[PDB]
Write a protein that holds these residues in place. Sequence first.
Motif, PDB file in Angstrom:
ATOM      1  N   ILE A   1       0.860  -1.180   0.000  1.00 23.18           N
ATOM      2  CA  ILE A   1       0.000   0.000   0.000  1.00 23.18           C
ATOM      3  C   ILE A   1       0.897   1.232   0.000  1.00 23.18           C
ATOM      4  CG2 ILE A   1      -1.770   1.283   1.242  1.00 23.18           C
ATOM      5  CD1 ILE A   1      -2.689  -1.323  -0.120  1.00 23.18           C
ATOM      6  N   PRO A   2       1.026   1.932  -1.124  1.00 24.97           N
ATOM      7  CA  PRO A   2       1.919   3.093  -1.172  1.00 24.97           C
ATOM      8  C   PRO A   2       1.407   4.236  -0.310  1.00 24.97           C
ATOM      9  CG  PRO A   2       0.628   2.960  -3.179  1.00 24.97           C
ATOM     10  CD  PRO A   2       0.335   1.706  -2.404  1.00 24.97           C
ATOM     11  N   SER A   3       2.346   5.064   0.136  1.00 28.70           N
ATOM     12  CA  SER A   3       2.027   6.198   0.990  1.00 28.70           C
ATOM     13  C   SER A   3       1.514   7.353   0.133  1.00 28.70           C
ATOM     14  CB  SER A   3       3.246   6.596   1.818  1.00 28.70           C
ATOM     15  OG  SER A   3       3.809   5.474   2.473  1.00 28.70           O
ATOM     16  N   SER A   4       1.303   8.506   0.759  1.00 25.97           N
ATOM     17  CA  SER A   4       0.813   9.694   0.081  1.00 25.97           C
ATOM     18  C   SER A   4       1.918  10.737  -0.002  1.00 25.97           C
ATOM     19  CB  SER A   4      -0.402  10.280   0.805  1.00 25.97           C
ATOM     20  OG  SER A   4      -0.854  11.462   0.167  1.00 25.97           O
ATOM     21  N   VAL A   5       1.904  11.508  -1.088  1.00 28.84           N
ATOM     22  CA  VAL A   5       2.881  12.575  -1.256  1.00 28.84           C
ATOM     23  C   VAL A   5       2.606  13.678  -0.241  1.00 28.84           C
ATOM     24  CG1 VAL A   5       1.545  13.752  -3.075  1.00 28.84           C
ATOM     25  CG2 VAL A   5       4.032  14.058  -2.928  1.00 28.84           C
ATOM     26  N   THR A   6       3.658  14.124   0.439  1.00 28.56           N
ATOM     27  CA  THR A   6       3.506  15.207   1.396  1.00 28.56           C
ATOM     28  C   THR A   6       3.183  16.507   0.662  1.00 28.56           C
ATOM     29  OG1 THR A   6       4.640  16.497   3.113  1.00 28.56           O
ATOM     30  CG2 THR A   6       6.011  15.528   1.368  1.00 28.56           C
ATOM     31  N   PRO A   7       2.298  17.336   1.207  1.00 26.76           N
ATOM     32  CA  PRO A   7       1.938  18.585   0.531  1.00 26.76           C
ATOM     33  C   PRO A   7       2.983  19.659   0.772  1.00 26.76           C
ATOM     34  CG  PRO A   7       0.606  18.308   2.507  1.00 26.76           C
ATOM     35  CD  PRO A   7       1.492  17.096   2.418  1.00 26.76           C
ATOM     36  N   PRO A   8       3.684  20.093  -0.273  1.00 27.17           N
ATOM     37  CA  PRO A   8       4.679  21.155  -0.099  1.00 27.17           C
ATOM     38  C   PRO A   8       4.016  22.521  -0.035  1.00 27.17           C
ATOM     39  CG  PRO A   8       4.644  20.462  -2.387  1.00 27.17           C
ATOM     40  CD  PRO A   8       3.562  19.673  -1.682  1.00 27.17           C
ATOM     41  N   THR A   9       4.515  23.358   0.871  1.00 28.02           N
ATOM     42  CA  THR A   9       3.969  24.699   1.021  1.00 28.02           C
ATOM     43  C   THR A   9       4.317  25.542  -0.200  1.00 28.02           C
ATOM     44  OG1 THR A   9       4.173  24.552   3.427  1.00 28.02           O
ATOM     45  CG2 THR A   9       3.908  26.743   2.467  1.00 28.02           C
ATOM     46  N   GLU A  10       3.298  26.141  -0.811  1.00 28.91           N
ATOM     47  CA  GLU A  10       3.519  26.997  -1.968  1.00 28.91           C
ATOM     48  C   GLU A  10       4.250  28.266  -1.550  1.00 28.91           C
ATOM     49  OE1 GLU A  10      -0.190  27.717  -3.903  1.00 28.91           O
ATOM     50  OE2 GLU A  10      -0.222  25.769  -4.918  1.00 28.91           O
ATOM     51  N   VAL A  11       5.208  28.686  -2.372  1.00 28.94           N
ATOM     52  CA  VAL A  11       6.069  29.822  -2.041  1.00 28.94           C
ATOM     53  C   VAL A  11       6.039  30.879  -3.147  1.00 28.94           C
ATOM     54  CG1 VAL A  11       7.471  28.454  -0.476  1.00 28.94           C
ATOM     55  CG2 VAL A  11       8.083  28.491  -2.835  1.00 28.94           C
ATOM     56  N   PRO A  12       4.949  31.632  -3.284  1.00 32.47           N
ATOM     57  CA  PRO A  12       4.940  32.722  -4.263  1.00 32.47           C
ATOM     58  C   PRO A  12       5.809  33.877  -3.797  1.00 32.47           C
ATOM     59  CG  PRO A  12       2.938  32.784  -2.985  1.00 32.47           C
ATOM     60  CD  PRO A  12       3.674  31.546  -2.549  1.00 32.47           C
ATOM     61  N   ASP A  13       6.532  34.464  -4.744  1.00 34.08           N
ATOM     62  CA  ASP A  13       7.468  35.544  -4.464  1.00 34.08           C
ATOM     63  C   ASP A  13       6.873  36.865  -4.931  1.00 34.08           C
ATOM     64  OD1 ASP A  13      10.353  36.260  -3.626  1.00 34.08           O
ATOM     65  OD2 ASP A  13      10.153  37.194  -5.604  1.00 34.08           O
ATOM     66  N   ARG A  14       6.777  37.825  -4.015  1.00 35.64           N
ATOM     67  CA  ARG A  14       6.214  39.136  -4.304  1.00 35.64           C
ATOM     68  C   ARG A  14       7.240  40.212  -3.978  1.00 35.64           C
ATOM     69  NH1 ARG A  14       3.664  40.907  -8.053  1.00 35.64           N
ATOM     70  NH2 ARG A  14       5.554  42.200  -8.084  1.00 35.64           N
ATOM     71  N   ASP A  15       7.487  41.104  -4.937  1.00 33.76           N
ATOM     72  CA  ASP A  15       8.437  42.204  -4.778  1.00 33.76           C
ATOM     73  C   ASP A  15       7.737  43.518  -5.096  1.00 33.76           C
ATOM     74  OD1 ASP A  15      11.085  40.999  -4.047  1.00 33.76           O
ATOM     75  OD2 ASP A  15      10.766  39.924  -5.932  1.00 33.76           O
ATOM     76  N   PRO A  16       7.010  44.077  -4.137  1.00 36.20           N
ATOM     77  CA  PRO A  16       6.450  45.416  -4.321  1.00 36.20           C
ATOM     78  C   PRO A  16       7.486  46.485  -4.004  1.00 36.20           C
ATOM     79  CG  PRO A  16       5.771  44.572  -2.202  1.00 36.20           C
ATOM     80  CD  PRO A  16       6.664  43.514  -2.819  1.00 36.20           C
ATOM     81  N   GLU A  17       7.210  47.695  -4.480  1.00 35.31           N
ATOM     82  CA  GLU A  17       8.144  48.787  -4.267  1.00 35.31           C
ATOM     83  C   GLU A  17       8.118  49.213  -2.804  1.00 35.31           C
ATOM     84  OE1 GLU A  17       7.568  52.181  -3.563  1.00 35.31           O
ATOM     85  OE2 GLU A  17       5.383  52.039  -3.382  1.00 35.31           O
ATOM     86  N   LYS A  18       9.134  49.974  -2.416  1.00 35.07           N
ATOM     87  CA  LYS A  18       9.237  50.471  -1.056  1.00 35.07           C
ATOM     88  C   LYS A  18       9.650  51.932  -1.071  1.00 35.07           C
ATOM     89  CE  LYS A  18      14.002  50.568  -0.458  1.00 35.07           C
ATOM     90  NZ  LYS A  18      14.842  51.634   0.152  1.00 35.07           N
ATOM     91  N   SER A  19       8.989  52.727  -0.237  1.00 34.17           N
ATOM     92  CA  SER A  19       9.557  54.004   0.149  1.00 34.17           C
ATOM     93  C   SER A  19      10.706  53.751   1.113  1.00 34.17           C
ATOM     94  CB  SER A  19       8.502  54.898   0.798  1.00 34.17           C
ATOM     95  OG  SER A  19       9.106  56.002   1.448  1.00 34.17           O
ATOM     96  N   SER A  20      11.650  54.685   1.148  1.00 34.23           N
ATOM     97  CA  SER A  20      12.848  54.491   1.949  1.00 34.23           C
ATOM     98  C   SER A  20      12.498  54.401   3.428  1.00 34.23           C
ATOM     99  CB  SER A  20      13.829  55.636   1.706  1.00 34.23           C
ATOM    100  OG  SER A  20      13.233  56.881   2.025  1.00 34.23           O
ATOM    101  N   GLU A  21      13.044  53.388   4.105  1.00 32.76           N
ATOM    102  CA  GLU A  21      12.970  53.356   5.561  1.00 32.76           C
ATOM    103  C   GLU A  21      13.801  54.462   6.192  1.00 32.76           C
ATOM    104  OE1 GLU A  21      10.588  51.268   6.031  1.00 32.76           O
ATOM    105  OE2 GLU A  21      10.922  50.664   3.949  1.00 32.76           O
ATOM    106  N   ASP A  22      14.649  55.126   5.400  1.00 39.05           N
ATOM    107  CA  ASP A  22      15.396  56.287   5.860  1.00 39.05           C
ATOM    108  C   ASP A  22      14.489  57.473   6.157  1.00 39.05           C
ATOM    109  OD1 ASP A  22      17.508  54.574   5.156  1.00 39.05           O
ATOM    110  OD2 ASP A  22      17.629  55.452   3.149  1.00 39.05           O
ATOM    111  N   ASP A  23      13.226  57.427   5.720  1.00 38.68           N
ATOM    112  CA  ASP A  23      12.271  58.461   6.106  1.00 38.68           C
ATOM    113  C   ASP A  23      12.097  58.499   7.617  1.00 38.68           C
ATOM    114  OD1 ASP A  23      12.010  58.647   3.356  1.00 38.68           O
ATOM    115  OD2 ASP A  23      10.154  57.481   3.305  1.00 38.68           O
ATOM    116  N   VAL A  24      12.186  57.339   8.270  1.00 40.21           N
ATOM    117  CA  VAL A  24      12.069  57.279   9.725  1.00 40.21           C
ATOM    118  C   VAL A  24      13.177  58.093  10.383  1.00 40.21           C
ATOM    119  CG1 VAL A  24      12.105  55.750  11.719  1.00 40.21           C
ATOM    120  CG2 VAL A  24      10.892  55.062   9.641  1.00 40.21           C
ATOM    121  N   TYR A  25      14.422  57.868   9.964  1.00 37.74           N
ATOM    122  CA  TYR A  25      15.520  58.618  10.553  1.00 37.74           C
ATOM    123  C   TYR A  25      15.520  60.070  10.087  1.00 37.74           C
ATOM    124  CZ  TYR A  25      20.093  58.953  12.862  1.00 37.74           C
ATOM    125  OH  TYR A  25      21.132  59.278  13.702  1.00 37.74           O
TER     126      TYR A  25
END
Lengths: 48, 46
Positions: A24-48
């Motif tokens: 009786i074969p086992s079941s394939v483990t479900p791999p966590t999907e890893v979508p990559d998102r790269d939105p723009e950023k305002s500078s964190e230097d605004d804080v300083y």
Amino acid sequence: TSIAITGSGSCRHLQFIPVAPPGIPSSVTPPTEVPDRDPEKSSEDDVY
Amino acid sequence: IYGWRKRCLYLLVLLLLIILVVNLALTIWILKVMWFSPTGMGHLHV
């Protein structure tokens, strides 16, 4: 002495000689999907 | 009257003080967001 009728080709998932296989074969483990998102950023230097 | 003369004198001193203070604030800003080095701006070199 022995006869072994086995499937192949289009019968890969089929074996036809009864050897009483309890495999009786086992079941394939479900791999966590890893979508990559790269939105723009305002500078964190605004804080300083 | 030397009195108001001295008064406006160090009033002008106060004005020069505030301009120096704001100039140091702007230059610390200009140094910070620039990652400035003698090699050049940021981690690169111009």
